[PDB]
Amino acid sequence: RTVTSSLKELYRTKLLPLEEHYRFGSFHSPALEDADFDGKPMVLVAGQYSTGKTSFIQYLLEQEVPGSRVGPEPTTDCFVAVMHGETEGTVPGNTFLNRFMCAQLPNQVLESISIIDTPGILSRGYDFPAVLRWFAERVDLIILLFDAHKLEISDEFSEAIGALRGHEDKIRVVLNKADMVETQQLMRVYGALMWALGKVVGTPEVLRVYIGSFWSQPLLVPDNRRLFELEEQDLFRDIQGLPRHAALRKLNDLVKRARLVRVHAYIISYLKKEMPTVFGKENKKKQLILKLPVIFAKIQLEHHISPGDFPDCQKMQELLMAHDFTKFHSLKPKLLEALDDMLAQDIAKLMPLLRQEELESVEAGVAGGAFEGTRMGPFVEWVVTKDKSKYDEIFYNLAPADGKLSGSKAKTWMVGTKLPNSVLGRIWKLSDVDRDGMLDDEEFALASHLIEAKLEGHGLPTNLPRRLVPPSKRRQ
Amino acid sequence: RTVTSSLKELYRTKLLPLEEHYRFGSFHSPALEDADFDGKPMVLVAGQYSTGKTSFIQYLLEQEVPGSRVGPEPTTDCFVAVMHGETEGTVPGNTFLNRFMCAQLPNQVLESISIIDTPGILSRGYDFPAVLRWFAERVDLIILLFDAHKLEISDEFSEAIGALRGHEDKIRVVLNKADMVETQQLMRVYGALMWALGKVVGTPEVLRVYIGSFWSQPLLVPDNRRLFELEEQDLFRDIQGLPRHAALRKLNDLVKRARLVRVHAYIISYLKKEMPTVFGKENKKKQLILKLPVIFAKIQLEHHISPGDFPDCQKMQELLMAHDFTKFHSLKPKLLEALDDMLAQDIAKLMPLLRQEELESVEAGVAGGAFEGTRMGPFVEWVVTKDKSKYDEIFYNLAPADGKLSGSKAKTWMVGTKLPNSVLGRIWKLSDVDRDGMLDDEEFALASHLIEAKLEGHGLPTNLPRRLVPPSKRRQ
Ligand SMILES: Nc1ncnc2c1ncn2[C@@H]1O[C@H](COP(=O)(O)OP(=O)(O)NP(=O)(O)O)[C@@H](O)[C@H]1O
Ligand SMILES: Nc1ncnc2c1ncn2[C@@H]1O[C@H](COP(=O)(O)OP(=O)(O)NP(=O)(O)O)[C@@H](O)[C@H]1O
Ligand SMILES: [Ca+2]
Ligand SMILES: [Ca+2]
Ligand SMILES: [Mg+2]
Ligand SMILES: [Mg+2]
């Protein structure tokens, strides 16, 4: 009596019949079970060799994976479905599953979701893309890893991303080990990545990248850790927030499928309606698949669907090559109508019910692993105008240019204050506000203030706060 | 007797004749003067409204521009050639120059180079792109500004970048005012920019962006200033290093032009060779321009040039529309040969002479403005193993889980040390190395060490250095 229930009935009564009639199962997807309506949300981790997928998961679980280890040059070569289970251990599952393993372990995260770990994308066994597309159809989130340490986008990869088409909304691109590269360089890599991806996925809507280094190791180059913890938090929120709304992603994928189904129905229908009854069959067919892009196109001319909805002409050509046309069924306006109406109105009403559900129970939310909150720790006019005239007395007794004291002179004086170099350098950096290399009266008074401050026994700030900036400070 | 000299003669004797014969001047570019061989290198600053072009220049010169002011909503509407001169002031210059102004001022930077400032690209007066292309042909560097504060890539802009085609090597993309946006957001914008640009310019080679805020104002959000000063330094080196090698960029642009010339020569030649002597002229022409892409293409079939070398078919169609075919000249293998040979062998020998020149005088280098060096300022096993057993005594007297002390307990103890919260929080952050939220024995000993340290009267580090990381530290 819930919403996924409603989705399921909608499917069974409105979609399934059309799929079965135009034999969707032998072209794109087999019919769905209850298992893909009533099962734990999956996240998929993909990327090329040594990008840290396994590490990433290890890190999400803050626990080691029974079957999967981690190493320098490529180690594991198959799909590991990291999922819940009462015992620690493993179990290895026309179709081929010997390239498929299953790991189980008592762990809350695995209560909330399950994480399927993939083989590394090469920088000739199966139809990797095809499987990525199958998962893409089924899965809740797709994590793509790039490592800022060895930026590479292989052909195979861009084929994979080609295969994730229509599901970009499920993609989280994470740029890993950003902590093992000097920052400028990071900028360089990030830039390259987004350029590349930009050209590759081709959508006008930009993918979010999460910048960090997903492992409990110390940070190599630490001067960016704020950003890393932040990005990590964002992604974690995104993952942790999955169980709360699977209904929505389900609904949505149902819509997408629907659209594809409708398209293909039209395709077969038209082919069948083009076929001659008894003789000529052969070449009317071969030619008919010679004229496929014409078909798709015209069908767009007179039906209103998006280039986004159509399958691949050539693959569809392979398969169409495999089928018998005379056996195809004809256009059936009834079932179609059922469809159009379904999505339109029925999904219309499911929306409101959905919202009402989308404020129900955060209990479903993913519980501690790398998610636990205790992991962040248990903890969390102008002042110199009084001494100005004095400072000025000094400053002007130091013979400045035209209001600006040379850097060298400033230094000799400063070092004259018998303070250690380091402190002084920091003070300089703090005081040279327009940062030209000299010190004018105000900047100088500031410097002096800071020197006195340190003399009293005061840690210096690391960034000059507004209240200390000479009043020629900043518009707002 | 120098290299630009040699270039000039090469041009005059090997290129000019071909241009003049196939009337290059009435299609792409007029013939060159000595003035574009013997003149001060230009840099061009472009971008859309309020991106800070004028500010950028102001900042490069560390001086205000006589004619050009700066404001909130769009202010200046023309081209300002900021160039050297003995007096401060201005002077306003079929062609139209009333959209052109000239400013002069005594200033070293203006001794080394001149900077042409442009109107803001709208987010119907002239052929903006065309002029950007003319400058692109002539100019040494092209600065494109985007502001991290209002990321927008207008149609007009992408038309401009479309117009910079073939000269991307001269492009420095700078993302301005990066200091007025929180860092994550910066990442977001940068990402967007590179995605967009990626899709727009279309080359497999990625453009460098320089991230900063080019003005002497204080920094809004300061926690990225290292990067900003760094990027600034890189760009400055790039600009400052121009006079040192104009010969190279000249040579190179000469090559590029050559290639274009050759192409177009072929085009006209073929058209003329297709034209019928006395009658039929009319439609053989109109049709001949109906079949232009066919021409270009076949000419690639049988001549070996790159899609990179060909003009725009449609524009060439407008102009071809303007010309008389019977007046065109025929293919002249001689002049062409002269060309091919020129670039090939002659440029071959110019290279070595060039290198010898490219180690001659850095004196030409741009002198102080924002370039002066004095602007950066006048300034620039494990230790706890001894007290370990003691610390451990405490740690284990605190009843930890299985080697890990809960965060709350750790806190009560720490706060027990009667240190201020802030310090303690910092210490925590420093000590929780695997950053899970508890403290194991080593991490705890570290914490203790740090606490004692602060008690003695010691500033805390801001980043735990390797020598202090418990020996389970980091692979290398
Ligand atoms: N965040 C990180 N920063 C730096 N190094 C890392 C990080 N994560 C993992 N590594 C190291 O980089 C390598 C990648 O390890 P791994 O986690 O196996 O990647 P992977 O994607 O599982 N490789 P594969 O499964 O063979 O495609 C290992 O040697 C790790 O020790
Ligand atoms: N680095 C910076 N950070 C923040 N704000 C800036 C920066 N540079 C300039 N501004 C402000 O942003 C606006 C842009 O000023 P301006 O230098 O005139 O840009 P512009 O590109 O010359 N505009 P236009 O010539 O009309 O296209 C002005 O109000 C400046 O005060
Ligand atoms: Ca100063
Ligand atoms: Ca810890
Ligand atoms: Mg692995
Ligand atoms: Mg301006």
Side-chain angles (χ1 to χ4, degrees):
Chain A
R1 72 186 314 104
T2 63
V3 70
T4 85
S5 120
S6 212
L7 261 25
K8 184 157 64 187
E9 276 314 66
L10 261 47
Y11 174 66
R12 180 187 69 86
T13 62
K14 290 283 182 84
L15 252 176
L16 185 46
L18 213 150
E19 298 185 16
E20 291 288 283
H21 200 219
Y22 299 93
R23 285 291 134 204
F24 192 75
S26 313
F27 277 104
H28 307 277
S29 265
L32 313 176
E33 321 145 314
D34 287 20
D36 31 19
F37 293 89
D38 301 326
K40 264 154 53 186
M42 299 143 154
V43 315
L44 180 146
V45 191
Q48 48 192 328
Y49 292 131
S50 298
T51 321
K53 289 160 275 151
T54 320
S55 286
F56 182 73
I57 306 174
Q58 189 114 126
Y59 181 71
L60 271 173
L61 304 178
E62 276 273 35
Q63 174 169 211
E64 203 137 56
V65 195
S68 274
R69 293 303 293 268
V70 31
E73 225 59 57
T75 50
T76 59
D77 52 346
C78 80
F79 298 75
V80 184
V82 192
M83 49 166 51
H84 185 63
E86 186 54 22
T87 201
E88 284 180 322
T90 67
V91 63
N94 210 112
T95 168
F96 306 117
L97 271 46
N98 198 190
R99 311 172 299 207
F100 216 115
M101 286 268 294
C102 171
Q104 302 184 1
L105 61 178
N107 175 323
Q108 292 181 96
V109 196
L110 279 326
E111 296 174 18
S112 302
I113 60 170
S114 39
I115 311 164
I116 116 85
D117 185 349
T118 59
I121 303 179
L122 100 24
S123 185
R124 297 100 271 180
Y126 32 88
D127 200 340
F128 192 61
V131 24
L132 263 178
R133 167 170 5 154
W134 188 84
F135 272 114
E137 287 175 356
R138 274 142 202 82
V139 154
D140 277 61
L141 267 190
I142 309 182
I143 310 301
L144 270 53
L145 292 214
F146 291 89
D147 95 309
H149 176 64
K150 274 198 53 192
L151 214 228
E152 144 73 314
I153 306 198
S154 58
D155 176 26
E156 183 173 304
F157 217 124
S158 71
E159 255 206 326
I161 290 103
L164 266 27
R165 171 144 142 326
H167 292 122
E168 18 263 334
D169 59 90
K170 296 188 185 175
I171 298 179
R172 303 307 173 271
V173 171
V174 354
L175 170 71
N176 207 5
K177 23 229 255 212
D179 84 302
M180 74 172 311
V181 96
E182 213 88 86
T183 139
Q184 260 173 321
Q185 175 61 26
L186 215 206
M187 297 307 149
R188 257 75 275 176
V189 170
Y190 181 22
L193 218 205
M194 294 300 276
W195 233 66
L197 279 183
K199 149 81 160 297
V200 183
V201 332
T203 173
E205 313 92 51
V206 32
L207 259 38
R208 165 81 139 100
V209 296
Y210 298 106
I211 319 196
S213 40
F214 301 73
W215 71 343
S216 297
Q217 223 62 29
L219 239 36
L220 209 187
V221 40
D223 48 64
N224 266 318
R225 94 152 145 278
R226 248 278 85 132
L227 200 263
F228 300 154
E229 32 186 9
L230 251 320
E231 299 284 88
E232 201 183 318
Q233 282 176 219
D234 287 5
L235 171 69
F236 288 159
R237 265 182 262 85
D238 220 337
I239 297 170
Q240 196 257 139
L242 291 183
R244 199 173 320 151
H245 42 277
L248 213 196
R249 94 102 187 107
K250 277 161 179 166
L251 169 59
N252 239 133
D253 294 327
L254 190 81
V255 177
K256 295 175 176 288
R257 168 180 269 245
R259 290 154 93 259
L260 182 68
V261 174
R262 142 126 79 27
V263 186
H264 162 95
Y266 281 131
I267 300 170
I268 266 65
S269 294
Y270 282 40
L271 291 158
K272 166 64 181 190
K273 87 177 177 61
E274 215 57 38
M275 284 294 294
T277 78
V278 55
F279 36 60
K281 24 183 49 54
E282 287 267 36
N283 70 240
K284 222 302 170 61
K285 179 202 161 190
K286 272 195 171 181
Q287 161 190 324
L288 256 180
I289 43 197
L290 207 61
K291 161 193 172 183
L292 222 213
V294 194
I295 298 288
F296 292 167
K298 292 186 181 303
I299 299 190
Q300 287 165 55
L301 274 174
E302 41 173 275
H303 270 302
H304 308 108
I305 44 271
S306 186
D309 290 51
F310 278 88
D312 182 309
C313 204
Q314 270 151 141
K315 192 69 178 181
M316 192 68 165
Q317 282 167 144
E318 269 195 312
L319 310 183
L320 258 299
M321 200 55 175
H323 286 41
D324 177 351
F325 283 33
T326 64
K327 305 263 195 55
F328 287 148
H329 289 286
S330 311
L331 199 155
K332 294 257 285 186
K334 26 170 289 177
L335 306 170
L336 275 135
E337 269 211 321
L339 205 262
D340 311 23
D341 182 80
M342 177 212 77
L343 36 156
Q345 319 213 44
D346 292 304
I347 286 174
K349 175 193 67 179
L350 271 189
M351 290 308 184
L353 196 186
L354 179 65
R355 302 151 56 87
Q356 181 61 252
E357 282 200 18
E358 193 153 308
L359 44 68
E360 276 316 1
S361 208
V362 64
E363 179 218 43
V366 200
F371 300 98
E372 46 189 8
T374 39
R375 282 186 80 266
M376 208 49 262
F379 279 84
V380 176
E381 173 76 24
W382 193 37
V383 215
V384 333
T385 30
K386 305 101 201 69
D387 301 310
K388 226 289 177 179
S389 26
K390 175 178 175 291
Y391 296 164
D392 280 6
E393 205 110 349
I394 286 87
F395 172 84
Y396 289 115
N397 258 123
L398 265 41
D402 65 358
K404 291 164 191 52
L405 178 65
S406 145
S408 56
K409 337 266 249 58
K411 185 184 195 180
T412 36
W413 171 72
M414 286 179 81
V415 101
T417 83
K418 287 154 56 64
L419 278 186
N421 203 241
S422 146
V423 168
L424 291 172
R426 218 139 73 224
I427 291 176
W428 171 268
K429 183 147 282 282
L430 250 34
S431 299
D432 186 13
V433 174
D434 50 352
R435 98 206 82 93
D436 54 346
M438 312 172 90
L439 297 166
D440 66 42
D441 62 321
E442 313 197 82
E443 278 171 314
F444 182 94
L446 210 198
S448 306
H449 176 99
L450 288 167
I451 301 189
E452 297 204 19
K454 226 297 145 41
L455 289 179
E456 245 87 76
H458 271 285
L460 259 30
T462 146
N463 286 121
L464 214 287
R466 178 186 176 100
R467 55 181 190 83
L468 270 186
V469 185
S472 321
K473 48 180 74 169
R474 244 271 193 196
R475 233 299 191 89
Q476 48 180 22
Chain B
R1 72 186 314 104
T2 63
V3 70
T4 85
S5 120
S6 212
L7 261 25
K8 184 157 64 187
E9 276 314 66
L10 261 47
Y11 174 66
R12 180 187 69 86
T13 62
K14 290 283 182 84
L15 252 176
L16 185 46
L18 213 150
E19 298 185 16
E20 291 288 283
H21 200 219
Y22 299 93
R23 285 291 134 204
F24 192 75
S26 313
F27 277 104
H28 307 277
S29 265
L32 313 176
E33 321 145 314
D34 287 20
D36 31 19
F37 293 89
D38 301 326
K40 264 154 53 186
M42 299 143 154
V43 315
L44 180 146
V45 191
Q48 48 192 328
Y49 292 131
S50 298
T51 321
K53 289 160 275 151
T54 320
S55 286
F56 182 73
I57 306 174
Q58 189 114 126
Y59 181 71
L60 271 173
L61 304 178
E62 276 273 35
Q63 174 169 211
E64 203 137 56
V65 195
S68 274
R69 293 303 293 268
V70 31
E73 225 59 57
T75 50
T76 59
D77 52 346
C78 80
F79 298 75
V80 184
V82 192
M83 49 166 51
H84 185 63
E86 186 54 22
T87 201
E88 284 180 322
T90 67
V91 63
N94 210 112
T95 168
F96 306 117
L97 271 46
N98 198 190
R99 311 172 299 207
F100 216 115
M101 286 268 294
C102 171
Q104 302 184 1
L105 61 178
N107 175 323
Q108 292 181 96
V109 196
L110 279 326
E111 296 174 18
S112 302
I113 60 170
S114 39
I115 311 164
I116 116 85
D117 185 349
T118 59
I121 303 179
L122 100 24
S123 185
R124 297 100 271 180
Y126 32 88
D127 200 340
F128 192 61
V131 24
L132 263 178
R133 167 170 5 154
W134 188 84
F135 272 114
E137 287 175 356
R138 274 142 202 82
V139 154
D140 277 61
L141 267 190
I142 309 182
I143 310 301
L144 270 53
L145 292 214
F146 291 89
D147 95 309
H149 176 64
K150 274 198 53 192
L151 214 228
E152 144 73 314
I153 306 198
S154 58
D155 176 26
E156 183 173 304
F157 217 124
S158 71
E159 255 206 326
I161 290 103
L164 266 27
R165 171 144 142 326
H167 292 122
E168 18 263 334
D169 59 90
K170 296 188 185 175
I171 298 179
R172 303 307 173 271
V173 171
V174 354
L175 170 71
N176 207 5
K177 23 229 255 212
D179 84 302
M180 74 172 311
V181 96
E182 213 88 86
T183 139
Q184 260 173 321
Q185 175 61 26
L186 215 206
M187 297 307 149
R188 257 75 275 176
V189 170
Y190 181 22
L193 218 205
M194 294 300 276
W195 233 66
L197 279 183
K199 149 81 160 297
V200 183
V201 332
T203 173
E205 313 92 51
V206 32
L207 259 38
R208 165 81 139 100
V209 296
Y210 298 106
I211 319 196
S213 40
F214 301 73
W215 71 343
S216 297
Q217 223 62 29
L219 239 36
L220 209 187
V221 40
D223 48 64
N224 266 318
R225 94 152 145 278
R226 248 278 85 132
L227 200 263
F228 300 154
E229 32 186 9
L230 251 320
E231 299 284 88
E232 201 183 318
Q233 282 176 219
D234 287 5
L235 171 69
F236 288 159
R237 265 182 262 85
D238 220 337
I239 297 170
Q240 196 257 139
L242 291 183
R244 199 173 320 151
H245 42 277
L248 213 196
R249 94 102 187 107
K250 277 161 179 166
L251 169 59
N252 239 133
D253 294 327
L254 190 81
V255 177
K256 295 175 176 288
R257 168 180 269 245
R259 290 154 93 259
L260 182 68
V261 174
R262 142 126 79 27
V263 186
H264 162 95
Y266 281 131
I267 300 170
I268 266 65
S269 294
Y270 282 40
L271 291 158
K272 166 64 181 190
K273 87 177 177 61
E274 215 57 38
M275 284 294 294
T277 78
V278 55
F279 36 60
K281 24 183 49 54
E282 287 267 36
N283 70 240
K284 222 302 170 61
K285 179 202 161 190
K286 272 195 171 181
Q287 161 190 324
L288 256 180
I289 43 197
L290 207 61
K291 161 193 172 183
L292 222 213
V294 194
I295 298 288
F296 292 167
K298 292 186 181 303
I299 299 190
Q300 287 165 55
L301 274 174
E302 41 173 275
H303 270 302
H304 308 108
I305 44 271
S306 186
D309 290 51
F310 278 88
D312 182 309
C313 204
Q314 270 151 141
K315 192 69 178 181
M316 192 68 165
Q317 282 167 144
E318 269 195 312
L319 310 183
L320 258 299
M321 200 55 175
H323 286 41
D324 177 351
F325 283 33
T326 64
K327 305 263 195 55
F328 287 148
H329 289 286
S330 311
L331 199 155
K332 294 257 285 186
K334 26 170 289 177
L335 306 170
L336 275 135
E337 269 211 321
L339 205 262
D340 311 23
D341 182 80
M342 177 212 77
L343 36 156
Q345 319 213 44
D346 292 304
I347 286 174
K349 175 193 67 179
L350 271 189
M351 290 308 184
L353 196 186
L354 179 65
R355 302 151 56 87
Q356 181 61 252
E357 282 200 18
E358 193 153 308
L359 44 68
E360 276 316 1
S361 208
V362 64
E363 179 218 43
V366 200
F371 300 98
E372 46 189 8
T374 39
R375 282 186 80 266
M376 208 49 262
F379 279 84
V380 176
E381 173 76 24
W382 193 37
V383 215
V384 333
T385 30
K386 305 101 201 69
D387 301 310
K388 226 289 177 179
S389 26
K390 175 178 175 291
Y391 296 164
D392 280 6
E393 205 110 349
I394 286 87
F395 172 84
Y396 289 115
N397 258 123
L398 265 41
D402 65 358
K404 291 164 191 52
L405 178 65
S406 145
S408 56
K409 337 266 249 58
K411 185 184 195 180
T412 36
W413 171 72
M414 286 179 81
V415 101
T417 83
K418 287 154 56 64
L419 278 186
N421 203 241
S422 146
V423 168
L424 291 172
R426 218 139 73 224
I427 291 176
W428 171 268
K429 183 147 282 282
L430 250 34
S431 299
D432 186 13
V433 174
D434 50 352
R435 98 206 82 93
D436 54 346
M438 312 172 90
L439 297 166
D440 66 42
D441 62 321
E442 313 197 82
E443 278 171 314
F444 182 94
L446 210 198
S448 306
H449 176 99
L450 288 167
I451 301 189
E452 297 204 19
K454 226 297 145 41
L455 289 179
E456 245 87 76
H458 271 285
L460 259 30
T462 146
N463 286 121
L464 214 287
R466 178 186 176 100
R467 55 181 190 83
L468 270 186
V469 185
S472 321
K473 48 180 74 169
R474 244 271 193 196
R475 233 299 191 89
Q476 48 180 22

